[PDB]
């Protein structure tokens, strides 16, 4: 009975299991329930608090993976495996997970907390890649993540209703920051410095808790990785998710009350049937169930809440990977697959962006088209590849972050901005895909530091450059080495200079305008063009 | 006859002259200035198209240039050099159409070919006259045979009421026609191969030169063609019928005045009134507003430029094209409000979308502000220098370099050997300001042999590029490649292809080969900016 390894949380005690890091051991608490099962009758409804437990409760393994679509698109690939969920799948999954260093903190210890993303529909906090044993051990930090609802379960909304109110996957997430508050300090952590850090639909998490006067008072700082909530994929109107709703419900074979009760009667599995044919428009970041716009956690649409916004006591870490949109190309747009180099057709080029910009008009697309032509070498199939590649990438996230980062500086917020450039050694997607979208978590989570993966050493530094820029911020606010002086400083990103960084193998290096011109045409000109 | 200097009297179809022994750098060189090659257009004539010159008697001094055909003069800048070396260096007159020959001294033994320039000035001024078209050196140095004509501007060259007889439109292209035609019967008498006529020009002129390989009636009085920053295609050069006719009769209004009774009242006005209200038929607040342009008719031009330069066919045809580095510098001046040759013109983002407004008359709300999302650098999009050099960019790409590249593109694509340019040096003698760059029209001296005056100031190694230059010119008139058959150690000027859009650098240093005559920015002016006036 190792004291270290049991917790007084307020529902009761904890044990937690010693797990050891390379350089030392860690105290892991896994699968603490954070909330009621939101089973049965509470399907859709938002979370509540979990009821006190008699007893050492075991936290010493993983619970089950909220329940979701799984992956089948490469199976036994693991570039695709390695999102898919690694543990049982449940609609009892509201469990949050604690790493604190071994032993405990002698002094309250900054938290950063880890939303996982997966566009709402998938991922879990037990993956991997999430791993918070090395931030734990080699950066003392007290790092927590938490299971929150993805796909129908978590936000399927009749917008107005009692029984279906919708956002209650960002409930969810809001409660296991609720916990934080309450529960930290017995861990070591300090609830007063709190960090939010996420990616893509994480992201996007973090963001709309940013935008959430309610979340507000539960964490201090916040990273966004790889995606933001602006942009075409992170919300949808009331309107469109009761349409959205609605649909799935004709589908399954179902008054708000009446249409809902009969949607609890279905098996979990009957609902993830049918989450990708609500949406039977060619998209490629289609996803059918995502927050709402509700006038309640979201008090107006993000653009709208990001360009009135008071950021003034914020910092913030945005950044994007080099390579963006790649990932999403083998998943629906014709010529693109993991296997070959898909080294496309002009006339494939045109047929994709009409999938890529789903939104688009055809004068739309043309512009598209026109903007990411190479006029010099119309036909190579390489520079049409590498275009499709950015103007998902660019549509869907560049530019999305370039636009909050702006309006976020703008608005008194301070804000540091990167760009990951460093492709994984050990990386199992083809070459033409440079660095894809989700392959920087496992460089800040600190997983080159196990041998036995098989990172090249130079990675093993990187990753712990990484590891302190993030802890760095979350203790500071501030990326930068607080008593290194002289490696290049990480300045902030500001509208008028508007500075980044490469994150890669060379040192710092601070490059201006993150797309400037090319952001500049979906940001500014592409609204004005589809409206009027 | 008798005591005169016998190497300068020659017979032409309409009877005989008598030239001028001038004075060039490294020798001398035989003018024949203004022999008329029309009947006057005067009276009656005013509007028609040319009659040929009716024979006259005796011998024909033709040794000083005539008169230049009536047209607005400049007063933007008085005194300055920079304005005035465009304005008339004779007297203004209906009675303008004459043309001049520069041949070798003595006269060469085999037929030289021949060089035909047409003077730009928007369709409103020029004149073969001016200083800077002084064909003695590329007489003298080249040994070729340099003829330019007088040809009216304004009014007189095309106000058309289409369909009319009193007033048919393109009169001025068919002054141009008369004159290749009068070059093909009359030129060997000079030493000329009417074999081979190369056609050059500049601005209006080159557009001139661009609408003659497009009317076939004209192909068979030349063999190859420059176009120096200026095309046929594009949103200056050409009117459609209805605009014209619109033009036409809202002038005949201001001046006071069935077609045929509109024009005889037309022509009872006195040409001092019809400049005096050339300017005011577009209140249209423009910088390329020329009222008076060739007018789409289909019989001079069949069809507008852009189908036939899209449907033509071009196999037998050898062209020569470029730009300058600062196409629209100079067009900014002449009222876009913050612009001045006097001061930087650095400007405010206010004065940019203003400007973009001026420049781009015929755009949409929505085109314009296309205009201004492609041209604002959005990481300072505040800055003075960016926006102001971002506005001579808008004007210079719309109005110049792009048509430019469109032309050089459709070409190609449909079978001709096509040379592609940019000129890139500043005269060190230039007295508009440093921030105009390399201006519209100041090529032309470089060219001529200009700098070979070694009274005018010219460096040593602007004489040097001068001569280069001269080279290039002649030697793609001669042969059809500006490429030297002898030096192939230098490096050699690639045809511009669509496959590869090879153009050369023309300055002080030996030819670079560049890729893509603003590739992306002429996407956007040639392919994208129409389909957004398309609704
Ligand atoms: C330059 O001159 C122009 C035209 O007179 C004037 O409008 C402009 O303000 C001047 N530029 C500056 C800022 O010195």
Not at 56 to 72: E, G, H, I, P, S
Not at 83 to 100: K, Q
Not at 134 to 141: D, N
């Amino acid at each position: 009975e190792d004291p270290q390894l049991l917790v007084r949380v307020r529902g009761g005690q904890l044990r937690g299991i010693r797990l050891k890091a390379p350089g030392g051991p860690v105290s892991a608490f896994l699968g603490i329930p954070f909330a009621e099962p939101p089973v049965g009758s509470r399907r859709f409804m938002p979370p509540e608090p979990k009821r006190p437990w008699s007893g050492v409760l075991d936290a010493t393994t993983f619970q089950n993976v909220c329940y979701q679509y799984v992956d089948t698109l490469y199976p036994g690939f693991e570039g695709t495996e390695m999102w898919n969920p690694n543990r049982e799948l449940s609609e009892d999954c509201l469990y949050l997970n604690v790493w604190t260093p071994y032993p405990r903190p002698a002094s309250p210890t900054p938290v950063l907390i880890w939303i996982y993303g997966g566009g709402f529909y998938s991922g879990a906090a037990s993956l991997d890649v999430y791993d918070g044993r090395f931030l734990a051990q080699v950066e003392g930090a007290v790092l927590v993540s938490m299971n929150y609802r993805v796909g129908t379960f978590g936000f399927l909304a009749l917008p107005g209703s009692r029984e279906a109110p919708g956002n209650v996957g960002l409930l969810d997430q809001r409660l296991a920051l609720q916990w934080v508050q309450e529960n930290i300090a017995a861990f070591g952590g300090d609830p007063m410095s709190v960090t939010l850090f996420g990616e893509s639909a994480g992201a996007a998490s973090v963001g709309m808790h940013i935008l959430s006067l309610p979340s507000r008072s539960l964490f201090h700082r916040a990273v966004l990785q790889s995606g933001t909530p602006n942009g075409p994929w992170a919300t949808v109107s009331a309107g469109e998710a009761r349409r959205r709703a609605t649909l799935l419900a004709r589908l399954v074979g179902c008054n708000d009350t009446e249409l809902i009760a009969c949607l609890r009667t279905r098996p979990a599995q009957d609902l993830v049937d049918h989450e990708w044919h609500v949406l039977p428009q060619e998209s490629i970041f289609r996803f059918s169930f995502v927050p709402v716009v509700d006038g309640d956690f979201l008090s107006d649409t993000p653009e709208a809440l990001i360009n009135t916004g008071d950021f003034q006591d914020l910092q913030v870490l945005v950044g994007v990977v080099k390579d963006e949109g790649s990932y999403f190309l083998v998943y629906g747009v014709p010529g693109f697959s993991k296997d070959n180099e898909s080294l496309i057709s002009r006339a494939q080029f045109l047929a994709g962006v009409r999938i890529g910009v789903p939104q688009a008009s055809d004068l739309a697309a043309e512009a598209v088209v026109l903007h990411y032509t190479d006029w010099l070498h119309p036909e190579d199939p390489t520079h049409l590849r590498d275009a499709m590649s950015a103007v998902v990438g660019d549509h869907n996230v560049v530019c999305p972050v370039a636009q909050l980062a702006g309006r976020l500086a703008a608005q008194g917020a301070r804000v540091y901005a990167y760009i990951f450039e460093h492709r994984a050694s050990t990386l199992t997607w083809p070459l033409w895909m440079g660095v894809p979208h989700g392959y920087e978590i496992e460089f800040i989570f600190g997983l080159p530091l196990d041998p036995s993966l098989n990172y090249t050493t130079e990675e093993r530094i990187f990753a712990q450059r990484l590891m302190k820029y993030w802890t760095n911020f979350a203790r500071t606010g501030d990326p930068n080495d607080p008593r290194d002086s002289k490696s290049p400083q990480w300045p902030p990103y500001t509208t008028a200079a508007q500075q980044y960084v490469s994150l890669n193998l060379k040192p710092l290096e601070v490059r201006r305008g993150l797309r400037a011109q090319t952001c500049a045409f979906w940001n500014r000109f592409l609204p004005k063009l589809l409206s009027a």
